[PDB]
Amino acid sequence: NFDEENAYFEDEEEDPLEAFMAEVEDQAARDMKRLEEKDKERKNVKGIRDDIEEEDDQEAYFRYMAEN
Amino acid sequence: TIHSQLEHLQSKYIGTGHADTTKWEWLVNQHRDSYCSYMGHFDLLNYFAIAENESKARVRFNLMEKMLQPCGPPAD
Amino acid sequence: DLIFCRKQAGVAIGRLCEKCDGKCVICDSYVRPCTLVRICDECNYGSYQGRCVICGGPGVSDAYYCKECTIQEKDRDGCPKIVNL
Amino acid sequence: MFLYNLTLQRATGISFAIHGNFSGTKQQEIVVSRGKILELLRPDPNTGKVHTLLTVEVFGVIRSLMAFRLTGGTKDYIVVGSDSGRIVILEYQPSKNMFEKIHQETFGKSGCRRIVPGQFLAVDPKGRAVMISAIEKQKLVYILNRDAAARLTISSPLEAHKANTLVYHVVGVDVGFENPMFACLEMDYEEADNDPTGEAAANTQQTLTFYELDLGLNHVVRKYSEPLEEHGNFLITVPGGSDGPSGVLICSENYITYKNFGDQPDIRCPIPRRRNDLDDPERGMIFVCSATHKTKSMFFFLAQTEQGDIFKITLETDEDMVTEIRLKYFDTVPVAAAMCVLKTGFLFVASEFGNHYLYQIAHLGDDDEEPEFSSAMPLEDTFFFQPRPLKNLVLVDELDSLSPILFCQIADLANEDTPQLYVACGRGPRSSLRVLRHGLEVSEMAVSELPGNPNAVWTVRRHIEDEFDAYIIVSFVNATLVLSIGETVEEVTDSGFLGTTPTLSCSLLGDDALVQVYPDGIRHIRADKRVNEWKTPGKKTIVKCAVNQRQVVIALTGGELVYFEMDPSGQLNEYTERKEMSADVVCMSLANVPPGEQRSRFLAVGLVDNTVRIISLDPSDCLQPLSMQALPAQPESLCIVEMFLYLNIGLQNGVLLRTVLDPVTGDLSDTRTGSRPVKLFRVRMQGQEAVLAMSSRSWLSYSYQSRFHLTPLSYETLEFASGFASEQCPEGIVAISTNTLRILALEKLGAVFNQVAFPLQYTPRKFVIHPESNNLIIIETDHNAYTEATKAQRKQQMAEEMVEAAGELAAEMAAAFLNENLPESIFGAPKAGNGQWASVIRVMNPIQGNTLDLVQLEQNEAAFSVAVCRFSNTGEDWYVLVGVAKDLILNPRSVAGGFVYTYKLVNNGEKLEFLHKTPVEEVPAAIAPFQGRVLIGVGKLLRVYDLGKKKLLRKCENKHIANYISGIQTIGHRVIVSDVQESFIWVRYKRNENQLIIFADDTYPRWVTTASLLDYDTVAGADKFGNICVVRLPPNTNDEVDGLLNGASQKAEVIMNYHVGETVLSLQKTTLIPGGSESLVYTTLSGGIGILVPFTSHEDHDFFQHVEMHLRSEHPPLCGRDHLSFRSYYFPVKNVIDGDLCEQFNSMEPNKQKNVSEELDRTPPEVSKKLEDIRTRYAF
């Protein structure tokens, strides 16, 4: 956020959008209600992160040392 | 512990052995990397495709299909 | 607990300090430096940005593999940073 | 023993091919991969010729090749994955004509490995990510970006590893500037290694896995994975975004499937079959390659089957969903390894073996009556189509390719003095026997022999902007005759020369002013009919002149140097000074004055003095001596030429000199290439300057972007020639012979060897040469093949069965199915059966191509060895022995037996007549004449055989050879045996005891492909894995024998080891050039030819060793390989210098050439001359 130009500029100080916001609010409220209800969720796994779900080489080495 | 890490990294590499390795594991390892070496080297595949009178794509697909269970299923 | 990192190496260059400047990271030789050392991204981050790969002091120059280690392709393993546990 | 390796003819087999805008302009180029060579080609859209622009040796194994372009750029990059542990990105530089390495990223150890990436390479269609993959668990992804200077940046790799997984193919998926996606065909083998019943091996399916790279979060995730119906080969990227849906095409066995993630169902289409197919009904059908053509209006695909049938695939789509796949038969071409569809409507076909093709796509769209198959069509049962000759394509160009070379013999079977190379190459019905000759092939332009004494002929046009010449003037001893080209060339009157006495100079002086010089003077002739004449004072008579369209120098008796000039007025003005010297001139030459300057300064003067003198002729210091240099002998003519300035010195012998144009000589090169005077004449090759040297044989001297070539031609002696131009052919030569007036042409773009081809039937295995008639006895053999009789009876069977199909029996397709056989060289041979063979014996004349005799063998007999010999118990009769296998299976190996045929080879070596047929219990793989009898390797057994009246009589036998005899060679006393897996066994035959005893063997396992005896103790061998070795017996070796390593008691030493990179199948010691030295010539399966030559002194060896050492460091291989490690692939190098690395010195930049040369205590020209000397000593 630093620039001698940014400081210079930031120093001199003294209907359709509403419709879009209303539609977004209705959609967001419906999604929030569905998540709170947790009544109809099949938990469809989107994308599996292999690194997050699989032990690293260093972790495997630590496990081996602990075992023997 | 550097030697122990080397002993864990050598085990990690696929194709390495140890004092309990059997004949079957050794032989399937060398068959599998033989098939990969055939897929890699351009003039070995040429030799095989001329020998058995097939297209090179067919020989490649046959080798990939043989990759799954070379030397038959294991013991007991 | 002198163990190499051995993670996938990235675009970051390894650094050496004033005490380790001429040394090879793997065999500790001083003759014929040949290949520039690369380190992984977790070894090059934040406070770890510039640090000796052998000891961990402030880096001053590039780390190199020796010709002997380059001939045996010992520059082809992972990150050679010495990490202690 | 120290050897130097040289390549004479590079490989011509293609492995991969990509196309794109690699030079940054709008024209398209193709980058093809040989095994270890990278090459850029550019097809001409005006003539359809394919020209080679650049070819580089990479000293590695190229395994994957892709092209990609960043958004907003106009230039394509090249991504290479090789057998090193590096990914490389290259850029073509058109102004430097070289490949510039942009990026190098190291990720693993070198070699073709299971789990180190480099086999598979995919790229994002928008160019923001690239994936490199191995056949096993490891996969890496690099992000590609760009800085503000528009240079390419690469990131650190992201890992996507997955244990116990095999990969069949990876492609990038086309999304609409969404997160990059990659698709993979994967297989998990973990369950199959734990089930001893063998049921987890079956019941195991391929999956189609999708990998998504999240550039916002910087990681790769597995999103989708679905099991497939059956196992499929390669994938095809469907164009997505705003032009097309975004899925994949899976090519499989008998099917092609479309697939996409989301709500899209799967769409399957079966592959159509040929109606009345003759191939084994158990065999399936797969696609072998594909080609996409995207247009701003539509797209389609081109896929080819194993039979060589190209189908056109289109996709019937909705707003987002795909509904049908439609297939339509397009054409039949040879089976290709890659196909490239080029804008401007060209299809490039790179075949797996043999010549490559470029086709013009003549018919766009499809307005035709032939049926179009669809996935919506119901079928219980498969589609059928009829193959026909080419309809959519036209053949425009054909590139020669010697791959695969299977057998070679270097021999003088014609009665020239230079030997020719007889090469059995090719596979299937496209095999052939090719004769290779070193030189250029003279194309016939015109012939009309006229009686008289022809001496010289020029080709001078009337205007300077004229592309049509004016006249050609052949001077007799008594007169001359000057003609013009009215397309019916005969006598001409309105020329203006009309010389009663001969014409020794005819030049275009002005725009349309002509200089006619003759023994009695010079008559300058205008455009209009006007002549200004200067004739001789008294009895001085000119013989030699030196013309140029701005100045004309002459030579009278006594070296009186007289110079003229024609200034912008356009007429004569002679200089004031006439410098005379001791003798009369014999040679001079005036360089073609360039349009940049006003006149020419240098004039080399060769006299009876035997000295070249260099003289100036500009008005400042005109005609005063500058530098003189004596000659070795009598000169005839010299000429200042380019392609930078040189001159050439022709002696009165068949030997030549060269000196670069400068006030002092700077370069020197002499070639012993005659006993007859050299005549130097002006010509134009490649549209630029060249000199046509003439001796008993006529040679063409031309550098080529620093590629000096002194190449002979395929015709005998001439006496005068010059360039030619006409409506008939605007670029040629007008050459004169004894009692002859010829016009000739040379149209081969820089080729070391000219070849003629003769077609064969099956894959040739081996041929021998009859010593008396010089005829060739060839054996051809193929697997999965029918004999002629079996084909005929199978077709008759299919006809009689289709006529009784139980249906009105009223319309007969069977009589039309039996009439015309589609040619197998175009549509392929019917590959039917697994243990089915087909073999043939052929007698062929090598001068012509005619087949003298042909013996066909039974169905499942396979010939593997052939020999021609004489037996001592018989007279001087010749015999042919053919070894044949009976019911051979290859995998698992099984054979029913073998036979040896015997023929009598009568009628002056033109006819074979059957004598008898001897059974053996194994495949006879090697037959060799030996001391009036024959040695035969019957599997593991080595036997001696004498000729009998009803069969061959076994005489001796050894039973201790290890595995399988693949070759036998004999020098007078000893026998050398090649084992399939062991290297070499030495045997002695005891003549009086009748014993074969093993007395020596080797200490290495070698998969020997061929062997060559170098002397009484040494053997040169080759290998399946691409290595050459030399093995020698120690001097201690005792021959008179009656194990220490479970082998023989005495061992042999290995004195040479070299990795070539390609599989050698022929080795032969021979002398290639007349009056040269003996070399070891080898031949490769990719179509390459090379030599290994010995060093004779320690100084040359040391110099070349230092050159190699310094070039290994300062000019490293292009794809990231270590040169010393590549030549040590299976064994460490021993006593070989790589001369293909050493000759890359001539293609470096001058700064690095100086840095290299100043360490050897030498200049770059001296190093270049030393490199050329050893090559011209042995090869061309």
Ligand SMILES: CC[C@H](O)[C@@H](C)[C@H]1O[C@@H]1C[C@@](C)(O)/C=C/C=C(\C)[C@H]1OC(=O)C[C@H](O)CC[C@@](C)(O)[C@@H](OC(=O)N2CCN(C3CCCCCC3)CC2)/C=C/[C@@H]1C
């Ligand atoms: C077994 C010996 C010990 O390990 C010992 C070296 C070491 O344990 C001590 C501790 C310590 C810090 O005092 C070591 C001293 C270091 C040295 C004597 C080395 O010198 C240097 O580091 C100087 C500097 O780093 C680079 C100089 C350089 C390039 O000559 C380096 O040696 C080389 O690379 N060579 C060896 C190869 N040699 C040939 C000569 C032809 C062309 C150059 C390359 C090939 C050139 C010089 C240093 C040598 C000393 C061993």
Ligand SMILES: [Zn+2]
């Ligand atoms: Zn080291």
Ligand SMILES: [Zn+2]
């Ligand atoms: Zn340090």
Ligand SMILES: [Zn+2]
């Ligand atoms: Zn690290």
